[PDB]
Amino acid sequence: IRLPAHLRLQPIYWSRDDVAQWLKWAENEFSLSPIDSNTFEMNGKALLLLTKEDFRYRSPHSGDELYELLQHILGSELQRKIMEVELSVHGVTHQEAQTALGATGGDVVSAIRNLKVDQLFHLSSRSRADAWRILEHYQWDLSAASR
Numbered sequence: 736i737r738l739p740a741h742l743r744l745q746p747i748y749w750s751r752d753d754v755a756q757w758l759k760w761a762e763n764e765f766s767l768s769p770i771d772s773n774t775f776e777m778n779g780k781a782l783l784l785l786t787k788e789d790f791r792y793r794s795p796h797s798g799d800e801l802y803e804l805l806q807h808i809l810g811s812e813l814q815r816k817i818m819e820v821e822l823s824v825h826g827v828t829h830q831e832a833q834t835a836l837g838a839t840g841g842d843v844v845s846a847i848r849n850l851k852v853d854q855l856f857h858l859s860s861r862s863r864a865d866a867w868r869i870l871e872h873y874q875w876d877l878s879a880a881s882r
């Protein structure tokens with residue numbers, strides 16, 4: 736298998752042009768059915784949010800192949816969990832999410848909450864338990880940071 740040079744194996748950083756390059760490469764390297772590049776008008780972050788059915792909607796004949804190819808390029812789930820954390824807490828970066836997820840043992844829910852209490856703790860002299868209490872009381876809504 737010959738990879739397309741100048742295309743890193745980090746799909747979370749792929750541009751729209753990189754997605755088109757990956758599609759063209761995949762169609763030729765795996766002899767797939769013709770893929771209209773106009774059917775994947777998105778960047779790499781968006782590609783990670785598609786389900787296998789979403790791939791099939793765009794390419795009934797080779798969409799699931801492309802999905803499995805993406806899964807193997809990603810390898811041994813974390814990149815998608817990181818995106819879910821980044822989509823749940825304002826101001827959290829890739830590294831902040833990865834640190835929180837590793838602390839919570841892959842738990843997205845606990846990582847989001849630990850990150851939410853961190854942000855709330857960053858604004859008051861209250862103890863972390865008081866921050867954990869207000870957030871548990873307010874159903875884990877960080878928007879209720881009223882003072």
Ligand SMILES: [Cl-]
Nearest residue numbers: 745746747814
């Ligand atoms: Cl990635």
